[PDB]
UniProtKB/Swiss-Prot annotation, chain A:
The gene is RPL21. One of its GO terms (molecular function) is structural constituent of ribosome. This is Large ribosomal subunit protein eL21. Residues 111-122, 135-144 have a biased composition (Basic and acidic residues). GO terms for biological process: translation. Residues 111-144 are annotated as: Disordered. Component of the large ribosomal subunit. It comes from Oryctolagus cuniculus.
Curated annotation (Swiss-Prot), chain B:
Belongs to the universal ribosomal protein uL18 family. It comes from Oryctolagus cuniculus (Rabbit). The modification Phosphothreonine is found at residue 230. GO terms for molecular function: 5S rRNA binding; structural constituent of ribosome. Component of the large ribosomal subunit (LSU). Part of the 5S RNP complex, which is a LSU subcomplex composed of the 5S RNA, RPL5 and RPL11. Component of a hexameric 5S RNP precursor complex, composed of 5S RNA, RRS1, RPF2/BXDC1, RPL5, RPL11 and HEATR3; this complex acts as a precursor for ribosome assembly. Interacts with isoform 1 of NVL in an ATP-dependent manner. Interacts with RRP1B. Interacts with IPO5, IPO7 and KPNB1; these interactions may be involved in RPL5 nuclear import for the assembly of ribosomal subunits. SUPFAM superfamilies: Translational machinery components. GO terms for cellular component: cytoplasm; cytosolic large ribosomal subunit; nucleolus. Component of the ribosome, a large ribonucleoprotein complex responsible for the synthesis of proteins in the cell. The small ribosomal subunit (SSU) binds messenger RNAs (mRNAs) and translates the encoded message by selecting cognate aminoacyl-transfer RNA (tRNA) molecules. The large subunit (LSU) contains the ribosomal catalytic site termed the peptidyl transferase center (PTC), which catalyzes the formation of peptide bonds, thereby polymerizing the amino acids delivered by tRNAs into a polypeptide chain. PANTHER family: LARGE RIBOSOMAL SUBUNIT PROTEIN UL18 (PTHR23410:SF12), RIBOSOMAL PROTEIN L5-RELATED (PTHR23410). It is found in: Cytoplasm; Nucleus, Nucleolus. Transmembrane segments: none annotated. This is Large ribosomal subunit protein uL18. Residues 251-293 are annotated as: Disordered. Keywords: Acetylation, Cytoplasm, Isopeptide bond, Nucleus, Phosphoprotein, Ribonucleoprotein, Ribosomal protein, RNA-binding, rRNA-binding, Ubl conjugation.
From Swiss-Prot, chain C:
Component of the large ribosomal subunit (LSU). Part of the 5S RNP complex, which is a LSU subcomplex composed of the 5S RNA, RPL5 and RPL11. Component of a hexameric 5S RNP precursor complex, composed of 5S RNA, RRS1, RPF2/BXDC1, RPL5, RPL11 and HEATR3; this complex acts as a precursor for ribosome assembly. Interacts with PML. Interacts with MDM2 (via its RanBP2-type zinc finger domain); negatively regulates MDM2-mediated TP53 ubiquitination and degradation. Interacts with NOP53; retains RPL11 into the nucleolus. This is Large ribosomal subunit protein uL5. InterPro entries: Ribosomal_uL5, Ribosomal_uL5_C, Ribosomal_uL5_CS, Ribosomal_uL5_dom_sf, Ribosomal_uL5_N. Keywords: Acetylation, Cytoplasm, Isopeptide bond, Nucleus, Phosphoprotein, Ribonucleoprotein, Ribosomal protein, RNA-binding, rRNA-binding, Ubl conjugation. The modification Phosphothreonine is found at residues 37, 40. GO terms for biological process: translation. The keyword Acyltransferase does not apply. It comes from Oryctolagus cuniculus. It is found in: Nucleus, Nucleolus; Cytoplasm. Belongs to the universal ribosomal protein uL5 family. The modification N6-acetyllysine is found at residues 45, 78. It comes from the Eukaryota.
Length: 159, 293, 170
RNA sequence: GUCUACGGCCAUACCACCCUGAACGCGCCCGAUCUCGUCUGAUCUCGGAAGCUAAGCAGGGUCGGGCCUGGUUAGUACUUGGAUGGGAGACCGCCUGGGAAUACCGGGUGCUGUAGGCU
RNA sequence: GCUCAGGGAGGACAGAAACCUCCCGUGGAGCAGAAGGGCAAAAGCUCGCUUGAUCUUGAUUUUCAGUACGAAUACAGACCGU
C-alpha cells in the first residue's frame, strides 16, 4: 500500500524547468480573467500558496467566480464509473486562459462576414469544412534526364 | 594549482537575472506589491507617482501598468524651472516641492479639473488631506513609488509627495518622515517643516560662511553670486515661483530640428569581412616565419 | 604624460590589536587606540571553540579602528619611524594593498600610563583611485574595469620614489 | 542615429580581454552649517558646480568560452496493431502505421512599448 | 537593512587552526526534524517594534460511501499589528 500524502508522486510535477527558477515574471500577474472564460491548469512550485491537487494538473475548465486573488473554476474528473464535475478554487499563478477557445472566435468572424458580403452579386459561400479529400490525377514531366536505379546494399560488420 | 571556478560547466548551468536587475534599478519585490490590481476590479487601472532624484536634478512621472509595458500619463520634470523665475536651486528639498506641484497642477490642467480642487495657496507646513464633494468630479488617489531611496525622516522624495497633495491630490501619507518631526518627544512640528520648503535652510549657509571668512563662500555659493541671488531675495523669490505654476501650468515644447544625416557610431562588421580578417593573419604569420628563418 | 582622474590616494587606515582574554586585559586594548586617533573603537566577537588557545563561542577577542582622509597620513607616517622606511617583497598582496606592523606602542608618540600599559599593533593601509567608490553604492553598482584596478607593480613604485624608502626580496 | 525615467519578453541580452565617444543626458567628483547615519560624510541623508572621459554606461572587435537555431548521426534506437513466422532457449526475422539524443560540420549574437530631449 | 558553503593573496607574538583586510564565488550554504520540492536587494544573517497562534455564520479540496474525524483552499463582518 502506498501512502496518502497530498504531494505524493509530484517529484517532477511541481518542479521548475532547467534555467527557470527564481522570480515570477510579471505579465502572469496582470491579465484579467473574466467569468466564463475557458482555462487550463498547471501547478507551479514557486508559490506554495494556492495550488490545485495533483489530479487536476493537466486538465481544463471554465470559470464561475472572481475575487481579489483567485478564481473559482469548474472542471470534469472521472472516479470509478461516473463523472463528477466540481468546483475548485485556485490562485492565479497556476492557470492560463484556454487556447483552442480563440481559433473559434476568428473563424466565426470569417463565417459571419462572407454570408452578408458576396450575396448581393450572386454566389453561394461554403462555410462548412471537409477533412482532407482524396487527391486527383497529375502529370510528372521528366526533363531530358531520368530516374535512378536503387539497388540495395550488401552487408558488412561495423564494430 | 587551485581548481578553476568559472569553467565550461559554470556557464552551462548559469541563470542570468532579469535585465533591469543586472543594470540595477528596479526592485521587483516591491514593484509586484506596487504595480498590480485585485482581480475583482478588472482593468480599472492602479495609479502611482514615480519620483527620482538624479545627481543634478529631479524627475516626476505618473503611471499605470499594462502588459505591453507601463504608460506615462504625465510628467513634469525639474529642468523646466528655468521658465518660472528660478535661476538656481534645482536638486534640493525646496525644488522637490515645485516639481511635485508642477506635476499636480499640470495633470489637473489635462482632464478638465482646473477649478475643482485647489489644494493650498499659503504654505503652512502641516498634515493636509483632500476631500470629495457632491455633484462634481472626484479626486486622484495614486500611491508613492520611492525607488531605492532609504526612507528617512529627511529626504527629498518626500518633498515631492507634499508638492502634489497641496496642488490637489488625495495621496495617503505620514508626518513621521517630514522634516521637523521630533522622533524623541513624538510630536509633529509645523514651522520647522515650513522652513525647509520655501528655502531658508540654504539661506543660513550664505551668512554663516561670509561672516566667518571669504574662502568657502567662493566654491560653494558661486552660481549664486554669478546670477545675483542674495540672502535678501531668498523668500522674496520662492513666493513668485508657486504663482506661475497656478497661473500657467500647461506644457510647451520645441520643434523637431532638421537632420544633417551622418554616421557617428560604428556598424557591425560582416561575415564576409570577418572571413577577410582570417586568411591575412594566418598567411602573414607564415611569410614572416620564412623571412625570420 | 598622465590623466588627472587616476590620482592614487589613500582610502582607509585599519588599526587593530589581538589579545585573547575577557576582563581588564581587553578594555586596556581600546585605550591605546584612543590616545592617538580620537574616536572610540568597537569590540568584536568569535566564530567557534578550539581550547588549545581558549576562546569560547561569542567570547571577545579583537578591537578595530578605521580612519580616513585628513587622518590617513598623520598616524601612518608615525608608524614608518618604527619600521625605518622599508618593507619586504613579501608584504604586498595581488590587488595592491601593503601590510606591516610594530612590536610596541610607546615610540609612536603616546606616553606610558602605569595601569593601561603597552600593546603591539597591526597596521593596514588600503590604496585606491577616484572611482573604486562605484563598487559599493546601492543604486546602480558595477565592477571597476582592468586599467583602473591596482596591481602589485603600482603599490611598489608609489612607496620607494616619494618617501625615498627601500624594499628587499626574501 | 542616440540617451534619459518607468517598463514587457528574460543570455540572440551572460562572461573574459581589447579598440572608439561629437551634442545633450547620466555619472566619477568637492563639500558637512541644517535635515538624516556611521568605530570611519567610505555607504546611507544633505549643500553645491573647481576638475575629466581614467572608470560605471554605450558602439564595435575575437578561426574566443557559453546561450539560440539548422545540418550529420537516422529512417539507426524505441513503438501501436498483427500471423498456428525462425529458434533447444536467449533472443531475432518480416506485416501494418507512429519515429528519439551526443560526438563531428554550418551560420546568428537582442528585440520592443509609454513619456522628455540632444545631433 | 545585510549576503552566505568554500577558495587565493596579504598582516606584530600566531603555528593547519584566535582575529583584521582587498579580490574571486548560480548558491556548492542556510530555513527545528525523515526524505523530496521551493527560496539570493530572499523564504536565508542583524536590529526594530509586536501577538491574524484573537471572535464568528456559511462554500470548497483532500481520504471518499463522493459519510465522520484529522489536516488544507478561496471569501465575507469585527476589532488589532506594522
Amino acid at each position: 500500500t502506498n501512502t496518502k500524502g497530498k504531494r505524493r508522486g509530484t517529484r517532477y510535477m511541481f518542479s521548475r524547468p532547467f534555467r527557470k527558477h527564481g522570480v515570477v515574471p510579471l505579465a502572469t500577474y496582470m491579465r484579467i480573467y473574466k467569468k466564463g472564460d475557458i482555462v487550463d491548469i498547471k501547478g507551479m512550485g514557486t508559490v506554495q500558496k494556492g495550488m490545485p491537487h495533483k489530479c487536476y494538473h493537466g486538465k481544463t475548465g471554465r470559470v464561475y467566480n472572481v475575487t481579489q486573488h483567485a478564481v473559482g473554476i469548474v472542471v470534469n474528473k472521472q472516479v470509478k464509473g461516473k463523472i463528477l464535475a466540481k468546483r475548485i478554487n485556485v490562485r492565479i499563478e497556476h492557470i492560463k486562459h484556454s487556447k483552442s477557445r480563440d481559433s473559434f472566435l476568428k473563424r466565426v468572424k470569417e463565417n459571419d462576414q462572407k454570408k452578408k458580403e458576396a450575396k448581393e452579386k450572386g454566389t453561394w459561400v461554403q462555410l462548412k469544412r471537409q477533412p482532407a479529400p482524396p487527391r486527383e490525377a497529375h502529370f510528372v514531366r521528366t526533363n531530358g534526364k531520368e530516374p535512378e536505379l536503387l539497388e540495395p546494399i550488401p552487408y558488412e560488420f561495423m564494430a | 594549482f587551485v581548481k578553476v571556478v568559472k569553467n565550461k560547466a559554470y556557464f552551462k548551468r548559469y541563470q542570468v537575472k532579469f535585465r533591469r536587475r543586472r543594470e540595477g534599478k528596479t526592485d521587483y519585490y516591491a514593484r509586484k506589491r506596487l504595480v498590480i490590481q485585485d482581480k475583482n476590479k478588472y482593468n480599472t487601472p492602479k495609479y502611482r507617482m514615480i519620483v527620482r532624484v538624479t545627481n543634478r536634478d529631479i524627475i516626476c512621472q505618473i503611471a499605470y501598468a499594462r502588459i505591453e509595458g507601463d504608460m506615462i500619463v504625465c510628467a513634469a520634470y525639474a529642468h523646466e524651472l528655468p521658465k518660472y523665475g528660478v535661476k538656481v536651486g534645482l536638486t534640493n528639498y525646496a525644488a522637490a516641492y515645485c516639481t511635485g506641484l508642477l506635476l499636480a497642477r499640470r495633470l489637473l490642467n489635462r482632464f478638465g479639473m482646473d477649478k475643482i480642487y485647489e489644494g493650498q495657496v499659503e504654505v503652512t507646513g502641516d498634515e493636509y488631506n483632500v476631500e470629495s464633494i457632491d455633484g462634481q468630479p472626484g479626486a486622484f488617489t495614486c500611491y508613492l513609488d520611492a525607488g531605492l531611496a532609504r526612507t528617512t525622516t529627511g529626504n527629498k522624495v518626500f518633498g515631492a509627495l507634499k508638492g502634489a497633495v497641496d496642488g490637489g491630490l488625495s495621496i495617503p501619507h505620514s508626518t513621521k518622515r517630514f522634516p521637523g518631526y521630533d522622533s524623541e518627544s513624538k510630536e509633529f512640528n509645523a514651522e520647522v517643516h515650513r522652513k525647509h520648503i520655501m528655502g531658508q535652510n540654504v539661506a543660513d549657509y550664505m551668512r554663516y560662511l561670509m561672516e566667518e571668512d571669504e574662502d568657502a563662500y567662493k566654491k560653494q555659493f558661486s552660481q549664486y553670486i554669478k546670477n545675483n541671488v542674495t540672502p535678501d531675495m531668498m523668500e522674496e523669490m520662492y513666493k513668485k515661483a508657486h504663482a506661475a505654476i497656478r497661473e500657467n501650468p500647461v506644457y510647451e515644447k520645441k520643434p523637431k530640428r532638421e537632420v544633417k544625416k551622418k554616421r557617428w557610431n560604428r556598424p557591425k562588421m560582416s561575415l564576409a569581412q570577418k572571413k577577410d580578417r582570417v586568411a591575412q593573419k594566418k598567411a602573414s604569420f607564415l611569410r614572416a616565419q620564412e623571412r625570420a628563418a | 604624460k598622465e590623466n588627472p582622474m587616476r590620482e592614487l590616494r589613500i582610502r582607509k587606515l585599519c588599526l587593530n590589536i589581538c589579545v585573547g582574554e575577557s576582563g581588564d586585559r581587553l578594555t586596556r586594548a581600546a585605550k591605546v587606540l584612543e590616545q592617538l586617533t580620537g574616536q572610540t573603537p568597537v569590540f568584536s566577537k568569535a566564530r567557534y571553540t578550539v581550547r588549545s588557545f581558549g576562546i569560547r563561542r561569542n567570547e571577545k577577542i579583537a578591537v578595530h579602528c578605521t580612519v580616513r582622509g585628513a587622518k590617513a597620513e598623520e598616524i601612518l607616517e608615525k608608524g614608518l619611524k618604527v619600521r625605518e622606511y622599508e618593507l619586504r617583497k613579501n608584504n604586498f598582496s595581488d590587488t595592491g594593498n601593503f601590510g606591516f606592523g610594530i612590536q610596541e606602542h610607546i615610540d609612536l608618540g603616546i606616553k606610558y600610563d602605569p595601569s593601561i600599559g603597552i600593546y603591539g599593533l597591526d597596521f593596514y593601509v588600503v590604496l585606491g583611485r577616484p572611482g573604486f567608490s562605484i563598487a559599493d553604492k546601492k543604486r546602480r553598482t558595477g565592477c571597476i574595469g582592468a586599467k583602473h584596478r591596482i596591481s602589485k607593480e603600482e603599490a611598489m613604485r608609489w612607496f620607494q620614489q616619494k618617501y625615498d624608502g627601500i624594499i628587499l626580496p626574501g
